[PDB]
């Protein structure tokens, strides 16, 4: 029992024609966790450390799948959250 839990119940609140804001439930564990990571498709995108996320550089009228991954300051990462299909 070292690595944290994978963020669950992801969602999307504010989303413009370039910048988007993601929200999700924090990990039940926080003994070594520092921040989260947002995946855009199959590669790492933006990075955060709170309960939200900001992704810039997004073309309009396009499909974008995002997710979240909790990390630890010791080399321990959790699983990926649900894929959020947002249309910019």
UniProtKB/Swiss-Prot annotation:
Q: Where is the Fibronectin type-III domain?
A: 6-88
Similarity comment: family membership: Belongs to the glycosyl hydrolase 18 family. Chitinase class II subfamily.
Give the protein name, as stated in the record: Chitinase A1
Q: Which gene encodes it?
A: chiA1
The part of the entire sequence present here spans 559 to 644 of 699
